[PDB]
């Protein structure tokens with residue numbers, strides 16, 4: 001079926017939970033043996049969210065190459081994304097090592113450091129120009145260059161320096177600051193505006209390594225972001241845009257990381273975002 005009318009048909013019939021459970025039943029199951037090794041317990045935020053072995057990002061290290069991060073490679077859309085958990089106190093250096101080694105231009109953050117009165121990820125970037133951060137375990141230095149605070153999101157320019165080689169690179173930090181502590185946004189308008197700002201920066205384009213996207217677990221809000229982006233790109237590329245099947249795209253993405261889209265409300269919100277976004281594109 002088309003999307004917008006499949007949408008009203010699920011709303012009128014109140015069957016979002018049944019649609020979402022079908023997706024969960026059909027989703028791929030692949031091994032995640034490296035994630036479950038005892039030496040990696042303090043590298044995982046949640047025991048039930050792990051990267052598959054076949055698609056995990058490897059750190060360029062001989063001691064321990066593990067990080068909770070996956071490469072999502074979308075062949076028809078010609079887009080790639082790295083989806084990862086929010087960094088932990090003992091993985092902030094690994095996180096920036098990955099950004100460096102994978103040649104990423106942008107980092108997309110979809111959570112606040114504290115939500116619901118608890119910490120959802122480490123404070124992993126500097127908050128003042130004159131107070132830089134040094135990650136001694138991976139030999140990197142990170143400096144805040146500039147910050148632009150808007151009503152729904154903040155954009156930061158950061159300098160990452162590889163202290164071994166003295167090479168430097170400019171990284172863009174795109175921080176969506178207004179996702180509610182509970183539920184999903186009422187309108188997709190500010191989320192779509194944010195996605196378009198990431199696109200306009202070049203961070204999603206083939207001349208750079210894959211964008212790094214995270215929330216707390218790296219599967220819910222993060223899954224919504226890449227699902228919406230890929231579906232809108234396919235609607236631009238194909239002769240028949242009504243052929244784009246958001247459930248099929250989501251199952252393809254779940255071949256590369258488990259659990260993408262965590263609730264039926266996130267599934268409904270993803271439909272809403274793609275539907276509204278397709279009208280603005282034209």
Ligand SMILES: CSc1nnc(NC(=O)c2ccco2)s1
Nearest residue numbers: 089092093131132133134135136
């Ligand atoms: C204010 S001067 C300074 N503080 N901290 C530095 N290094 C780190 O904060 C760090 C490494 C891993 C997590 O935090 S340089």
